[PDB]
Amino acid sequence: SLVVQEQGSFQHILRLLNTNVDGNIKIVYALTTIKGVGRRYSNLVCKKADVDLHKRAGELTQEELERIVQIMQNPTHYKIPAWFLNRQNDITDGKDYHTLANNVESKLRDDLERLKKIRAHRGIRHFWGLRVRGQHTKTTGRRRA
Amino acid sequence: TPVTLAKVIKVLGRTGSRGGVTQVRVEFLEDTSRTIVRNVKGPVRENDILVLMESEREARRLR
Amino acid sequence: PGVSVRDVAAQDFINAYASFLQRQGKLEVPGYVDIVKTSSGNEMPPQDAEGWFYKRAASVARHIYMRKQVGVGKLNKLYGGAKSRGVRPYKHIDASGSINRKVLQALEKIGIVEISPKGGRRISENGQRDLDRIAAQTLEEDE
Amino acid sequence: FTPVVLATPIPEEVQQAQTEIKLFNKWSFEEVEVKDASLVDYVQVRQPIFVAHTAGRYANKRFRKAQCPIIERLTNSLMMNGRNNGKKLKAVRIIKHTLDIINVLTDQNPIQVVVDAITNTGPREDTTRVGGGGAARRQAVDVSPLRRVNQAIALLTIGAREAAFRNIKTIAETLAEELINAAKGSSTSYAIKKKDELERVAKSNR
Amino acid sequence: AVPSVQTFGKKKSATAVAHVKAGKGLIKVNGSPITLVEPEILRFKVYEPLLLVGLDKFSNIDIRVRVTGGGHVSQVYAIRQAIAKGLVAYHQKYVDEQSKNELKKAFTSYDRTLLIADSRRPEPKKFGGKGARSRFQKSYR
Amino acid sequence: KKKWSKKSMKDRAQHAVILDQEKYDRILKEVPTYRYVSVSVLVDRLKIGGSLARIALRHLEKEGIIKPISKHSKQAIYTRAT
Amino acid sequence: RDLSEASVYPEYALPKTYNKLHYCVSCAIHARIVRVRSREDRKNRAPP
RNA sequence: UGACGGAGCCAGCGAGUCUAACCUUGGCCGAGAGGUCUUGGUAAUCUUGUGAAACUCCGUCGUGCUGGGGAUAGAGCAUUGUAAUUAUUGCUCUUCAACGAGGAAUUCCUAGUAAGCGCAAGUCAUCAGCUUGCGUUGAUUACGUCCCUGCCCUUUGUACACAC
RNA sequence: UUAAUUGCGAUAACGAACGAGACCUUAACCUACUAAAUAGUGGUGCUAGCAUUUGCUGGUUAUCCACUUCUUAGAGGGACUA
Question: Taking the domains of chain B in order of start, what are their residue ranges?
Answer: 1-63
Experimental technique for the deposited model:
cryo-EM
Q: Is F19 on the interface with A (CB under 8 A)?
A: yes
Say which nucleotide is closest to residue E134, CA to C1' distance.
H108
Helices assigned H by DSSP within chain A: 27-32, 39-49, 62-73, 101-118, 121-128
All structural domains of chain E with their residue ranges: 1-141
Helices assigned H by DSSP within chain D: 12-20, 64-67, 70-77, 88-104, 110-121, 145-164, 171-184, 190-204
Expressed in percent and rounded to 5, the helix, strand and coil fractions of chain F are 40, 10, 50
Q: Comparing C-alpha atoms, which of E1, E15, E25, E18 is closest to residue E82?
A: E18
d(CA A47, CA A57): 15
Residues of A whose CB is below 8 A from F15: 24
- Domains: count for chain C: 1
Q: Give, as ranges, the nucleotides of chain H with any atom within 7 Å of a protein CB.
A: 1-12, 24-33, 39, 48-49, 51-65, 67-76, 85-88, 90-96, 98-101, 106-119, 128-147, 154-157
d(CA G44, CA G41): 5
Q: What is the separation, in whole angstroms, between the first and last Cα of chain G?
A: 31
- Domains: count for chain D: 1
Mutation pick from E10, E11, E45, E72 vs chain D, by most beta carbons of D within 10 Å, is E45
Largest CA-CA distance found in chain A, in angstroms, rounded = 62
User: Do the Cβ atoms of A143 and A137 come closer than 8 Å?
Assistant: no
Residues of B whose CB is below 8 A from D63: 43, 45
C118 touches strand I (CB under 7 A): yes
Residues of F whose CB is below 8 A from D173: 36, 38, 40-41, 75
Residue-level length of chain G: 48
Helices assigned H by DSSP within chain B: none
User: Exposed, middle or buried, C7 (CB in 10 Å: 0-12/13-18/19+)?
Assistant: middle
User: Exposed, middle or buried, A138 (CB in 10 Å: 0-12/13-18/19+)?
Assistant: exposed
Q: Comparing C-alpha atoms, which of C92, C91, C108, C88 is closest to residue C100?
A: C108
Give me the residue from E33, E35, E45 closest to D51, CB to CB: E45
Residue E123 identity (one-letter amino acid): E
Q: Which residues contact D44 (CB under 8 A, 6 or more apart)?
A: D67, D68, D69, D70, D71
Residues of A whose CB is below 8 A from F1: 143
d(CA E123, CA E133): 9
User: Do the Cβ atoms of F55 and F63 come closer than 8 Å?
Assistant: no
Q: Which residues contact A139 (CB under 8 A, 6 or more apart)?
A: none
Q: Is F20 on the interface with A (CB under 8 A)?
A: yes
A touches F (3+ CB pairs < 8 Å)?
Answer: yes
Q: Comparing C-alpha atoms, which of D165, D169, D188, D166 is closest to residue D178?
A: D188
List strand residue ranges (DSSP E) for chain E, in order: 4-10, 15-22, 26-29, 32-33, 61-68
Q: Comparing C-alpha atoms, which of E72, E34, E38 is closest to residue E51?
A: E34
Give me the residue from F50, F69, F74 closest to D170, CB to CB: F74
Mutation pick from A44, A46, A47 vs chain C, by most beta carbons of C within 10 Å, is A47
Residues of A whose CB is below 8 A from F20: 3
E21 has which bridge partners?
E4, E62
G touches C (3+ CB pairs < 8 Å)?
Answer: no
Residue D122 DSSP class: S
User: Exposed, middle or buried, A77 (CB in 10 Å: 0-12/13-18/19+)?
Assistant: exposed
* Angle value at C-alpha D205, between D199 and D206, nearest 5 degrees: 80
d(CA F80, CA D105): 12
Stretch 119-138 of chain D: residues touching chain F, C-beta under 8 Å:
none
CB contact under 8 A, F18 and A143: no
Q: Is A143 on the interface with F (CB under 8 A)?
A: yes
Integer distance in angstroms from CA D75 to C1' I73? 45
Say which nucleotide is closest to residue D160, CA to C1' distance.
H1
Among protein residues, the one whose C-alpha sits closest to the C1' atom of H73 is A108
In this structure, the strands spanning E4-10 and E32-33 are unpaired
Residue-range definition of the domain harbouring residue D169? 1-206
Q: What does the CA dihedral B50, B51, B53, B57 come to, rounded to 10 degrees?
A: 10
Expressed in percent and rounded to 5, the helix, strand and coil fractions of chain B are 0, 45, 55
d(CA A45, CA C49): 11
User: Exposed, middle or buried, C15 (CB in 10 Å: 0-12/13-18/19+)?
Assistant: middle
Cα dist from A145 to A124, A129, B20, C83, whole Å: 18, 10, 52, 34
d(CA D101, CA D172): 8
Integer distance in angstroms from CA D73 to C1' I71? 38
CB atoms within 10 A of CB B45: 14
Q: Is D60 on the interface with E (CB under 8 A)?
A: no
Largest CA-CA distance found in chain B, in angstroms, rounded = 35
Phi, psi of F68 (to 5 degrees): -85, 150
Q: Is F58 on the interface with A (CB under 8 A)?
A: no
Q: Which residues contact E39 (CB under 8 A, 6 or more apart)?
A: E72, E76
Say which nucleotide is closest to residue B44, CA to C1' distance.
H144
Interruption sites in chain D after residues (C→N beyond 2.5 Å) = none
Phi, psi of E18 (to 5 degrees): -115, 125
User: Do the Cβ atoms of B40 and D145 come closer than 8 Å?
Assistant: no
C114 touches strand I (CB under 7 A): no
d(CA D139, CA D146): 19
CB contact under 8 A, D63 and B26: no
User: Do the Cβ atoms of E18 and E8 come closer than 8 Å?
Assistant: yes
Integer distance in angstroms from CA E14 to C1' H134? 15
CB contact under 8 A, D173 and F39: no
* Angle value at C-alpha F55, between F51 and F56, nearest 5 degrees: 115
Q: What does the CA dihedral C61, C65, C69, C72 come to, rounded to 10 degrees?
A: -20
Q: Comparing C-alpha atoms, which of C8, C114, C122, C125 is closest to residue C65?
A: C122
Q: Give, as ranges, the nucleotides of chain I with any atom within 7 Å of a protein CB.
A: 26-29, 31, 41, 47-51, 53, 55-60, 69-71
Stretch 12-71 of chain A: residues touching chain F, C-beta under 8 Å:
24, 56, 58
CB contact under 8 A, C6 and E30: yes
Q: Please, how many CA atoms are within 13 Å of residue E135, restricted to the half-sphere of its CB?
A: 3
Residue-range definition of the domain harbouring residue C132? 1-143
E6 touches strand I (CB under 7 A): yes
Integer distance in angstroms from CA E131 to C1' I13? 52
